[PDB]
Amino acid sequence: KMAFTLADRVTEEMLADKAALVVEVVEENYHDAPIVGIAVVNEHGRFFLRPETALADPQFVAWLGDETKKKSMFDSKRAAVALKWKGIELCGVSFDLLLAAYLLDPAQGVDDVAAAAKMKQYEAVRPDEAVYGKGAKRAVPDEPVLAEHLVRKAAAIWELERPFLDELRRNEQDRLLVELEQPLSSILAEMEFAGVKVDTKRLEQMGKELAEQLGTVEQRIYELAGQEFNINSPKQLGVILFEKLQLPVLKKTKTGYSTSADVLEKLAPYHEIVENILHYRQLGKLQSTYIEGLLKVVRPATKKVHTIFNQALTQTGRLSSTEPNLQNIPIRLEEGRKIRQAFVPSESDWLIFAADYSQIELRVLAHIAEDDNLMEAFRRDLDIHTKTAMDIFQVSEDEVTPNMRRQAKAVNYGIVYGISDYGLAQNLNISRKEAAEFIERYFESFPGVKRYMENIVQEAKQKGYVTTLLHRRRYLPDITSRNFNVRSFAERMAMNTPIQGSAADIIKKAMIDLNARLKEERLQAHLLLQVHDELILEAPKEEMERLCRLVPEVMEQAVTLRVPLKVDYHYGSTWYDAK
DNA sequence: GCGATCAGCG
DNA sequence: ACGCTGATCGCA
Ligand SMILES: [Ca+2]
């Protein structure tokens, strides 16, 4: 019902300087995934191409990598990475519908063209599930069905750029798309394609150690419990702890006894079995997620893993890492921190460089809340986490153990993000009256922060949404709900999203200024990972001197707040040695 | 499929 | 009864 040409060859009218391009990659993980079809819509008409034909034509390949040939797409990173696995570059992406919908409303959950088209009353295009099917029924259709679906998606992108750019401009989000998210999309594509090398031999050795350590801990659990049970079974573990051993019931989930880590920590004076169960899970978490799971996704010929950086998923504008997740690699426990030793540079005589912001959200909060004392604290380069560990535990700066500091990290972010005296009393294991007094003293030192959190909830109730420093937006319809639980979670989202989202916008602008700077200096250094507030790079060891002077200044100068930004950097032979 | 749990980021 | 994620696993 839509006219298009099924082009056998590549012609000149298909190579206009403005076009809507669709490079379809049906598989979820687009790394090394087959391209099933190509569709182009421009001023001259609508065209469908077969990938074996076009991707071997020199004029079509030159048209893809020509930055002066502007292309409108949906999810340009998916196509760009799949083309990189085919030796083909893709430049000139002037509009990405996927990221344009993500800025307008992040909760819409837009994952295909049809969902984004519905936001603008465009429905002349089928959802991808209706074309390819669900799960075990997933199948690329017959060429006439596939060719029309790809052309209808291209025609939809062709018609939706203008109305999407109009609403972005009213939301003050148009420069957020064109100057931040779309340039970031190209950088993330190179990071995903570059991959991160893994020492498969060392990981395989840890797995054999964890295999025989897990049995020893598992046998002591059976010794202390007096019988065998599925340690991962909540029913039997609940029977062992709160029926057999008759331990106190401190928490009940919707399904039964709660055996979470915070609960088992409080049962430590009562029995020695809860401390080994804790150790068993930690060894089990490392074994399943980071040993077996990591070796599953490694590419054997290159010993590199290729993550997918999801740019249009989080509600605050953060990134996320999938298959594998390289943003929750262990670090706090020494047994699990060794796994970071397996992450190595991709070439000999290369090293890993890693820089990160120091308490970025509290500094963003100081700027936005305009609090006198909080801005003074960071103008002195104070360590609020250590300074809070002194006030809590009555110790001095010398006696602040990294455990007392990480616990003060929770109090600092918890208090500013609406923790109650109940929740504070459970984390500090203090009386509920002391925790309430501590929160009163905390807001006496920072009255402007308390004033800001009241204003940001009142502004959310008025506007219906909250914004970040670069005008990223999150709607909060529940902020006016009649239910107390539903409204309170919305109020704490209004306190947190502008702060966490403004930190995401700063690290994103830093990535863009970093690659433009690395290009100017003509360095072979390139980014590998982003962990929210940390940037990880690899580079030849000779470039390390320049990077120690370049990366900190680039990150510190990404934005200009009423307080300075601080960046700490390290380099070394592995990711482990890079912090 | 989902909830409990836990790894990370603030 | 601070916020934002992804992976694993048992299933009450
Ligand atoms: Ca940090």
Closest CA to B5 C1' — which residue? A260
SS3 content of chain A, % helix, strand, coil (to 5): 55, 15, 30
Query: Sheet containing A93-96: which strands, arranged edge to edge?
Result: A5-6, A45-49, A37-42, A18-24, A70-73, A93-96
Beta strand A18-24 with A37-42 is antiparallel
Q: Say which DSSP state A227 is in.
A: S
Distance A560 CA to ligand 1 centre (A): 19
Whole-number Å distance, CA A340 to C1' B8?
13
CA A338, CA A284: separation in Å to the nearest integer? 15
Selection from A354, A332, A333 nearest residue A343 by Cα: A354
Distance A548 CA to ligand 1 centre (A): 17
CA A481, CA A367: separation in Å to the nearest integer? 30
- Nearest DNA or RNA nucleotide to A426 (CA to C1'): C1
Residue appearing with tokens 């191409």: A49
SS (H, E, C) A285-333: HHHHHHHHHHHHCCECCCCEECCEEECCCCCCCCCEEECCCCCCCCCCC
Whole-number Å distance, CA A313 to C1' C4?
11
CA A392, CA A386: separation in Å to the nearest integer? 10
Q: For strand C, is any atom closer than 7 Å to the CB of A496?
A: yes
| Exp. method | X-ray
CA A179, CA A169: separation in Å to the nearest integer? 13
Q: For strand C, is any atom closer than 7 Å to the CB of A414?
A: yes
Query: Of all helices (H) and strands (E), which one includes residue A492?
Result: helix A484-520
Domains along chain A with CATH numbers: 1-193 (3.30.420.10), 194-308 (1.20.1060.10), 309-359+504-578 (3.30.70.370), 360-503 (no CATH)
Distance A487 CA to ligand 1 centre (A): 31
CA A556, CA A554: separation in Å to the nearest integer? 6
CA A229, CA A238: separation in Å to the nearest integer? 11
Whole-number Å distance, CA A223 to C1' B10?
41
Selection from A328, A231, A212, A207 nearest residue A280 by Cα: A231
Q: For strand C, is any atom closer than 7 Å to the CB of A219?
A: no
* Resolution as reported, in Å: 2.7
Closest CA to C9 C1' — which residue? A232
Distance A119 CA to ligand 1 centre (A): 37
CA A346, CA A415: separation in Å to the nearest integer? 42
Q: For strand C, is any atom closer than 7 Å to the CB of A313?
A: yes
Q: What's the one-letter identity of residue A415?
A: I
CA A189, CA A298: separation in Å to the nearest integer? 18
In a 3-state reduction of DSSP, which class is residue A207?
A: helix
Strand C: list positions under 7 Å from protein Cβ.
Answer: 1-12
Q: Please compute Rg for chain A using Cα positions.
A: 27
